[PDB]
Ligand binder design. Sequence first.
Ligand SMILES: C[C@H](NC(=O)OCc1ccccc1)C(=O)N[C@@H](C)P(=O)(O)O[C@@H](Cc1ccccc1)C(=O)O
Ligand SMILES: [Zn+2]
Length: 307
Amino acid sequence: ARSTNTFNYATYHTLDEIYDFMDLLVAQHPELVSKLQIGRSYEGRPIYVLKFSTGGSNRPAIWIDLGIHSREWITQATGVWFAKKFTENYGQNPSFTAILDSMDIFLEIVTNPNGFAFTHSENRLWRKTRSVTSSSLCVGVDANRNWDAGFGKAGASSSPCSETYHGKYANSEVEVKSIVDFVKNHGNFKAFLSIHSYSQLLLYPYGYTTQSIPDKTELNQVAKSAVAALKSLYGTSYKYGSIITTIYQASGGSIDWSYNQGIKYSFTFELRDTGRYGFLLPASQIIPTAQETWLGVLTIMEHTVNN
Ligand SMILES: C[C@H](NC(=O)OCc1ccccc1)C(=O)N[C@@H](C)P(=O)(O)O[C@@H](Cc1ccccc1)C(=O)O
Ligand SMILES: [Zn+2]
């Protein structure tokens, strides 16, 4: 609250507290991290991305976003702990230091800020964005069904009131289009990780079709390796496989889009638990969850460095 060493990582925070932590972290480490505004949400909130960078021109980069689905509160909490963790380990861990010496990391902690506010002010289990339009008194688009990969196909709903509603057309949600523009204008991302909760799964492309990706052998192996690093800490068991195969058919998801843009290392994590608490994970599981998913995410970045 006036030092990120004083910040309580073991509790759930509001949007203001998280954007203030971003300002404290940048002020504490101005040579390693900066805060970029890549857009504004439907209702007018700034959308912030943190860039962690050791220098260079157009370094190969890693995208990580959290909270695209606002009720999944373990993910924005894990992202605050990640941001802090990168300024603690850089210069101490050989592995992490070697990734950041050749690559940059972009971290988006709250991808859907209006939805996250709503989960605090009115409905804890709100999933969608907050746009209103037109044709329905039902608010919101599922922002993980709004991307241009299999858009509009089976695996998303067309009624506005559905939790899985895809939107009128791809990238209709400014929260999605802001990332699409930013990743394209950068033009040198090598990995794209989108973190959700729960089911304890590590998923790779496709959700919208049963056809295997051309890179399915290599990504299945990276997923085998990341899932074993994660399990090493506390015994937490993950499954892994393509989206459509390992949880269900879904069209318009972000990782299918990034993979189709040529970002080969595209993965989504489904964090703790497997059903007991669901979206309502105890605050006493935040840091255990954050610490073992760190191990799985480090294993993916190391493989992106080496290839
Ligand atoms: C919409 C769904 N609703 C729900 O009630 O989930 C129940 C459930 C429980 C256990 C297993 C499966 C589903 C839900 O919130 N799903 C979550 C499990 P989550 O939002 O993390 O799933 C992700 C999966 C995904 C990942 C990449 C590309 C496409 C799809 C998602 O729906 O976006
Ligand atoms: Zn989700």
